[PDB]
Amino acid sequence: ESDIIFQDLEKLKSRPAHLGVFLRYIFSQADPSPLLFYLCAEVYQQASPKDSRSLGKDIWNIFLEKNAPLRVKIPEMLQAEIDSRLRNSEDARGVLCEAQEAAMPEIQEQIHDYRTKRTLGLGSLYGENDLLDLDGDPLRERQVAEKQLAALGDILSAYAADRSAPMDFALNTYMSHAGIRL
Known part of the structure; x- marks a missing residue:
């Protein structure tokens, strides 16, 4: 049930096609930073x-450093811990998890926004x-997800x-990790 999936990020993370649809909305109308960051932090912790x-280093330069292009703002206390670890190629899974929590509120809001688009047909x-x-068959889901990834690239080309570039890097980091490539 799409309605069920689009409502819960936890479900959405596991459904490539749906995530792709949601991402097309994000890439087209909203700030892609929080979700792309979240998806990259998710890949990092695995x-x-x-x-x-x-990857920790790319995450830092793209989303968290002073002039990051897809900047995600987080508590100064957290920003410092993350900077130190990622910098020293240390284990930042913990702090990144803490960072993910900081991005959740905006992701949720975007999730609401997209559901509104659905309600509006x-x-x-x-x-x-x-x-x-989609027909329960994983082969099918990979094919539908792939079509979305192709469409996202078209959105980014403009x-x-x-x-x-950073959005493409983040997007591909997750998709690739999810067994989806163009």
Whole structure:
């Protein structure tokens, strides 16, 4: 049930096609920072303590440092801990988890906003038609999710480089990790 999935981030994280639809809305109308950050932090806390070290660094430069392009604001106390660890290639899974919590409120609001778009019958503008194609078969879900990823890239092709590059990096970091690639 899409209604069930779009309502809960925890469910959405696990459903690539749905996440893709939601992302198309985000990329088109809202600030992609909180969710892309969340998705990257999510990948980080599940990466090989080798791939994470550099991923931690990208996460810092893209979302958390002073002039990050997809800046996510977090408590000064937390920002310091995260900076230190990621900088020293230390274990930031804990603090990043703390950071994710800080982004949740805005993500939730965006989740509400997208549901409003659905209530208004605007879901087709963001790939919801392809959701009809889902038939429990994982092969199908990968195919629908893929179509969304392709559409997100088209959305990004129109944005300024200092915005599309980091968004593309973050997006692909998650999708790739989710077994979805163009």
